[PDB]
Amino acid sequence: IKVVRSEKEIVVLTRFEEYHFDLEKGILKDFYTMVDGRKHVFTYGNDGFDVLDEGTPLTVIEEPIVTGVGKVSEGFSDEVSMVYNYGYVKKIFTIKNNENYTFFVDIESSKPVDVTVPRVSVDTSTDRYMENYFASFNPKTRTLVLLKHDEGLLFEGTLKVNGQKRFIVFMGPNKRTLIKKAFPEDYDVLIKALVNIPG
Amino acid sequence: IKVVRSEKEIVVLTRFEEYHFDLEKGILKDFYTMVDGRKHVFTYGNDGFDVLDEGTPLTVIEEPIVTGVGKVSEGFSDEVSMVYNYGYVKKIFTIKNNENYTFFVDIESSKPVDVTVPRVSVDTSTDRYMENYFASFNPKTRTLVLLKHDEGLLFEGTLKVNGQKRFIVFMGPNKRTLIKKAFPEDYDVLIKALVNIPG
Amino acid sequence: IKVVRSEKEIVVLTRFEEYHFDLEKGILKDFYTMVDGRKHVFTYGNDGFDVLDEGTPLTVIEEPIVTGVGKVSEGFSDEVSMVYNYGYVKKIFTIKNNENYTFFVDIESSKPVDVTVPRVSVDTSTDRYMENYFASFNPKTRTLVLLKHDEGLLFEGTLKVNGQKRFIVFMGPNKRTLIKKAFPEDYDVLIKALVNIPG
Amino acid sequence: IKVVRSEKEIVVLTRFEEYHFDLEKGILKDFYTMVDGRKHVFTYGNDGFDVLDEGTPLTVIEEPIVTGVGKVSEGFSDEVSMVYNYGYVKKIFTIKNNENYTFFVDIESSKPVDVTVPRVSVDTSTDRYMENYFASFNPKTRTLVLLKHDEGLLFEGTLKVNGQKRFIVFMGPNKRTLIKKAFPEDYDVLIKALVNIPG
């Protein structure tokens, strides 16, 4: 809802979410929840939606563009989008004022690329490779990451993209209602599988 | 936000707007504002977005579909859409929870068709045919209709549709900020033009 | 919008255009604009889309077919098409009711042929061979022809046809909005490049 | 994904597919699936996309060309294409790394030709001529061929080519997800129709 573009990064602020995106690689740098005090729940390893071509991370050919609907005094009102252009790869992050801890990654390529996925867990013990979904849980911050990748047990740790593809990313507290709003169709199977993580 | 589908019409209800759509012709039956008590500000004459093919109105080949995002206990939370299928014409009404008195008419055709435009004014005196915009004002109810038709002074009282086109329709009180939120770029010229209507 | 077949030629008539096509050679014989009174702006030299096998013009093997959508009392309402069948070459003119002085020439051949391109200029002085586009301008009549040949500066005065190709032909007044509508992807490059002609 | 040109045949090898093409006639010589060990499921009878001009088959006028995108250490990473030029007929096989047992045959002729269609069945018993599709099934190898010929029940056993046409060919295991992925518009009609084959 509030966009602050710095010389080193772009910051998107809502009432409960604080996103930090870079300018050169199109990565999610940092994510904070603010529902119970400013809490640094995600930080960039090599997993913030890097676009890997054949085995090397790609950088953008131009500065990212910031757009959205409902430009209020403070940036936008209901939608913010950030466009990253790698030439033959376009990547758009979309954040809506739904206060659901859910953002979108609409991505398009000419040749197939690999998009690393964010992990909030300390170790692989609290990560789940589920059908069409990647789950990552941090028991310290109680933070959940649910990425709908639509690869149906073929996921190998990176999003294989070729052509148009939208990814839905949940990143926030373990609040069951918010997961139902983010993934209404698969909610039942999802929660039933998420029980198996320590939690 | 709240959808009530009876056997004779579909009713969309937000905190300030009350829409009534029919089931056979894809028309806006009635529109109420609820900001200063339930006020019947629009009613169907022959102008509720009737689809006129050659010179005769069309009816749908199937019952309309209701979709949207954020399926809550009471219908949807953030967006409602209604799909009307005339066979070679598809017409979709979209209402978002922006509380802006603004809805969208996404329309598509295989042959050129005509879409009648709503008028809230008792007479033509308080109607304006402006660049890319039709305005209609009812001084009794203080109700403004602003339709962005993108026909550029060539508008003749009916929307000419051929292929894909989206219409943005503001319908509600004469409130500066809401018009700016609806049409940010043309706002200056629009309102400087709306001065000429009684008001 | 109106078609008149006269056992010697086919005439197509919209509100601003009057095309005269022959029946034996599939050529554009004459073109009239009517926005400022009936003005004879094109007359067939040797360039009304003649199909040349070597330098040998071809004749159709059958009489042309006239088709279209929305058959109104006067011919057609939104689309007229004329099919010329040279046996091993098909050539279809299409005139849509866009009121944009823009028609289409869809062409398909079995062997490489050459199609002449209409000129409106008195001399080669006011012609331009641009990237993917032929431009002819007549300073007296104020008529501009823009042909999208998509041959990228390899154009030598005739369309090289082998296989399927669509040509977009603008023939009318130097109106920037109409150029923007006809060629929406390249209009900036085109409008800037046309400054070099007298204009 | 790996191309081996043996000066006598061209072999294209993916994770689950092995195609054997010749060099003189542009035919499919042999096809192996590998998902359950190397299983020889197609051998050329007189049905490996032979171009029959009217009575006799055609040979290419020049050696085929191998092209593709993402040229990795082993041929190409994601697309391979073989161009066969018969002078007045061009035939391009395309194999994408979609792991869908689905390849494409883009074809363009100057005069009407016939292209034979591969069969995996021992007899005509397990074959079906369906709306826009040819179906061949082998009950011992569990291999299904679905060719989208788009000739709508006018198909007579050979592809009628006269211009530009694209054929989508599925060749592989009877797997509904894959058929859905290759033919997403007709998958329900197709899959229901296939029940009539033994299976």
Provide, as residue numbers in chain D, all residues whose Cβ is less than 8 Å from the Cβ of C108: 163
Partner-chain contact D70 A111, CB within 8 Å: yes
Label residue D3 left, alpha or beta by phi (over 0 means left) and psi (-120 to 50 means alpha).
beta
CA distance D179 to D163: 27
Chains that touch A (3 or more CB pairs under 8 A): B, D
Of A71, A78, A184, the CB nearest to B71: A184
Q: Greatest CA span in chain D, whole angstroms?
A: 45
Q: Which two tokens stand for residue B112?
A: 């050129």
Chains that touch C (3 or more CB pairs under 8 A): B, D
DSSP annotation string for D38-68: -EEEEE-SS-SS-EESSSSBP--SS--EEE-
Q: Which two tokens stand for residue B186?
A: 């043309």
CA distance D20 to D32: 9
For this experimental structure, what is the resolution in angstroms?
2.5
Query: Which of A67, A76, A78 to probe the B interface (max B CBs under 10 A)?
Result: A78
Q: Which two tokens stand for residue A44?
A: 């960039």
Looking up tokens 């009239």 gives C32
Query: Which among A75, A63, A58 is positioned nearest to A114, based on CA atoms?
Result: A58
Query: Which of C110, C111, C165 to probe the D interface (max D CBs under 10 A)?
Result: C110
Please state, in angstroms and as integers, the Cα–Cα distance from residue A127 to each residue in A116, A153, A159, C46, C103, following that order. Answer: 15, 14, 16, 74, 60
User: What is the chain C residue with the closest CA to D162?
Assistant: C110
Residues of A with CB under 8 A from a CB of D: 54, 111-112, 162
Residues of D with CB under 8 A from a CB of C: 88, 108, 110-111, 163-164
Segments in A33-186 forming alpha helices (H) = 176-182
Backbone torsions φ then ψ of A62, nearest 5 degrees: -140, 165
Residue B35 has what DSSP assignment? B
How far does the CA of residue C90 sit from the closest CA of chain D (Å)?
A: 11
Neighbouring C-beta atoms of residue D174, cutoff 10 Å: 15
Of B70, B96, B98, the CB nearest to A181: B70
Q: Which two tokens stand for residue C107?
A: 């062409």
Partner-chain contact A77 B181, CB within 8 Å: yes
CA distance C83 to C90: 7
Partner-chain contact D88 C110, CB within 8 Å: yes
Query: Which of D89, D90, D110 to probe the C interface (max C CBs under 10 A)?
Result: D110
CA distance C19 to C121: 18
Residue B98 has what DSSP assignment? T
Cα radius of gyration (chain D): 16
Query: Which among B123, B146, B116 is positioned nearest to B133, based on CA atoms?
Result: B146
Residues in CB range of D4: below 8 A, 6 or more apart:
D10, D11, D13
Cα radius of gyration (chain A): 16
How far does the CA of residue C193 sit from the closest CA of chain B (Å)?
A: 27
CA distance D185 to D197: 21
Provide, as residue numbers in chain B, all residues whose Cβ is less than 8 Å from the Cβ of C69: 111
Sign of the torsion angle spanned by Cα atoms D133, D138, D139, D144: negative
Please check whether residue A94 is in contact with residue A84, taking contact to mean a CB–CB distance below 8 angstroms. no
User: What is the chain D residue with the closest CA to C112?
Assistant: D110
Residues of B with CB under 8 A from a CB of A: 70-71, 77-78, 96, 98, 181, 184
CA distance D118 to D138: 12
Partner-chain contact D110 C108, CB within 8 Å: no
Residues paired with residue A133 on neighbouring β-strands, in sequence order: A130, A148
The strand pair at C133-138 and C143-148 is best described as antiparallel
Cα A146 from chain centre: 9
DSSP annotation string for B128-193: EEETTEEEEEETTTTEEEEEE---TT---SEEEEEEEEEEEEEEEE--HHHHHHH-TTTHHHHHHH
Provide, as residue numbers in chain A, all residues whose Cβ is less than 8 Å from the Cβ of D72: 54
CA distance B161 to D67: 44
Rounded to 5°, the CA angle A19-A22-A24 comes to 160
Chains that touch D (3 or more CB pairs under 8 A): A, C
Task: Please name the method used to determine this structure.
Answer: X-ray
A-D contacts (CB, under 8 Å): 12
Query: Which among D83, D85, D81, D82 is positioned nearest to D59, based on CA atoms?
Result: D85
Looking up tokens 């073989």 gives D82
Partner-chain contact D70 A162, CB within 8 Å: no
Q: Which two tokens stand for residue C154?
A: 């390899």
Query: Which among A55, A51, A53, A54 is positioned nearest to A25, based on CA atoms?
Result: A51
Q: Is A131 helix (H, G, I), strand (E, B) or coil?
A: coil
Partner-chain contact B162 C78, CB within 8 Å: yes
Partner-chain contact C110 D108, CB within 8 Å: no
Please check whether residue C102 is in contact with residue C146, taking contact to mean a CB–CB distance below 8 angstroms. no
DSSP annotation string for chain C: -EEEE-SS-EEEE-SSEEEEE-SSS--EEEEEE-BTB-EEEEE-SS-SS-EESSS-B---SS--EEE-SS--SSS-SSEEEEEEE-SSEEEEEEEETTSSSEEEEEEEEEEEEEEE-----SSGGGEEEETTEEEEEETTTTEEEEEE---TT---SEEEEEEEEEEEEEEEE--HHHHHHHSTTTHHHHHHHHTTS--
Helix (H) or strand (E) holding D176: helix D176-182
Helix (H) or strand (E) holding A188: helix A187-194
CA distance D131 to D149: 9
Partner-chain contact C70 B112, CB within 8 Å: yes
Partner-chain contact A112 D78, CB within 8 Å: yes
Residue B63 has what DSSP assignment? P
How far does the CA of residue A97 sit from the closest CA of chain B (Å)?
A: 10
User: What is the chain B residue with the closest CA to A178?
Assistant: B70
Neighbouring C-beta atoms of residue C133, cutoff 10 Å: 24
Looking up tokens 């003189």 gives D24
How far does the CA of residue B70 sit from the closest CA of chain A (Å)?
A: 6
Q: Which two tokens stand for residue B115?
A: 């879409």
Provide, as residue numbers in chain A, all residues whose Cβ is less than 8 Å from the Cβ of D77: 54, 111-112
The yes-or-no reply on A/D contact (3 CB pairs or more, < 8 Å) is yes
Neighbouring C-beta atoms of residue A90, cutoff 10 Å: 18
User: What is the chain D residue with the closest CA to A152?
Assistant: D177
Provide, as residue numbers in chain A, all residues whose Cβ is less than 8 Å from the Cβ of B70: 98, 181
User: Residue A122 half-sphere exposure, CB side, CA atoms within 13 Å?
Assistant: 6
Residue A126 has what DSSP assignment? G
Partner-chain contact A54 D77, CB within 8 Å: yes
Partner-chain contact B184 A71, CB within 8 Å: yes
